[PDB]
Paper text:
Herein we report unprecedented location‐dependent, size‐selective binding to designed lanthanide (Ln3+) sites within miniature protein coiled coil scaffolds. [7f] Our design (MB1‐2) features an asparagine (Asn, N), aspartate (Asp, D) hard oxygen donor binding site within the hydrophobic core of a parallel three‐stranded coiled coil (Asn‐Xxx3‐Asp)3, and was found to bind Tb3+, Ce3+, Nd3+, Eu3+, Dy3+, Er3+ and Yb3+, in addition to Gd3+. The structural constraints of binding sites buried within a three‐stranded coiled coil are such that an optimal Ln3+ radius for binding falls between that of Nd3+ and Tb3+. In conclusion, we demonstrate for the first time that designed coiled coils can discriminate between Ln3+ ions based on their size, and that this ability to discriminate is related to the location at which the binding‐site has been introduced.
To elucidate the structural origin of Ln3+ selectivity, a crystal structure of an optimally sized Tb3+ bound to the designed (Asn‐Xxx3‐Asp)3 site in the size‐selective central binding location was obtained. Attempts to crystallise the MB coiled coils repeatedly proved unsuccessful, so an analogous coiled coil scaffold more amenable to crystallisation was adopted, based on CoilSer (CS) and the longer derivative GRAND‐CS, designed by DeGrado and Pecoraro, respectively. The external residues, which are likely critical for the formation of favourable crystal packing interactions, were retained, but the core was replaced with that of MB1‐2. Thus the Leu hydrophobic core of CS was replaced with Ile, and our Asn and Asp binding‐site residues were introduced into positions 12 and 16. The resulting coiled coil, HC02, displays similar Tb3+ binding to that of MB1‐2. To the best of our knowledge this is the first crystal structure of a Ln3+‐binding site engineered within the hydrophobic core of a coiled coil, and provides excellent confirmation of our designed (Asn‐Xxx3‐Asp)3 binding site. The refined structure is consistent with all Tb‐O distances for the binding‐site residues falling between 2.3 and 2.6 Å, in good agreement with previous peptide/protein complexes. Though the electron density cannot assign whether it is the Asn nitrogen or oxygen that is bound, the Tb‐X distances are in better agreement with Tb‐O than the longer Tb‐N distances reported in the literature. With the exception of the terminal residues, involved in the formation of favorable crystal packing interactions facilitated by external Tb3+/Zn2+, all residues, including the binding‐site residues, fall within the preferred region of the Ramachandran plot for α‐helices. Consistent with the experimental evidence of an optimal radius, attempts to obtain suitable crystals with smaller and larger ions, such as Yb3+ and La3+, respectively, have so far been unsuccessful.
Author numbering:
A (entry chain A), B (entry chain B), C (entry chain C): 1 to 36
The structure:
C-alpha cells in the first residue's frame, strides 16, 4: 500500500506540473494579445 | 486511515482533470481571438 | 509515512487551488478581451 499510494501521488505531482506549464504558455499568448 | 487517503487522492484526480478540460476550452477561445 | 503522505496531499491541494484561481481570472479576462 505504501508504494502504491507513493506512485499515485508522484503521478499527480507530475500532472500538476504539466498543467502549470500549459498555464504559462496561455498567459504568454494573452500577454501578446494585450500588447497589440 | 488508508481508505481516507485513497478518497482524498481520487478527489484530487477529479479536480486536476476538470482543470484540464477548462484549459482545453481556453486554448480554443484564444486561438479564435488570435486570428478572427 | 502516514503523516508525510498527508503533508504531500495538503501541498497538492493548495497548489491545485492556486491553479483554480488563475483559471477564474483568465476566464474573466478572455471574455473582457472579447468584449472589446
Ligand atoms: Tb493535483
Ligand atoms: Tb482501499
Ligand atoms: Tb494527520
Ligand atoms: Zn513507500
Ligand atoms: Zn519507494
Ligand atoms: Zn490521518
Amino acid at each position: 500500500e505504501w508504494e502504491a499510494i507513493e506512485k499515485k501521488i508522484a503521478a499527480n505531482e507530475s500532472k500538476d506540473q504539466a498543467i502549470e506549464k500549459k498555464i504559462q504558455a496561455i498567459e504568454k499568448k494573452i500577454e501578446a494579445i494585450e500588447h497589440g
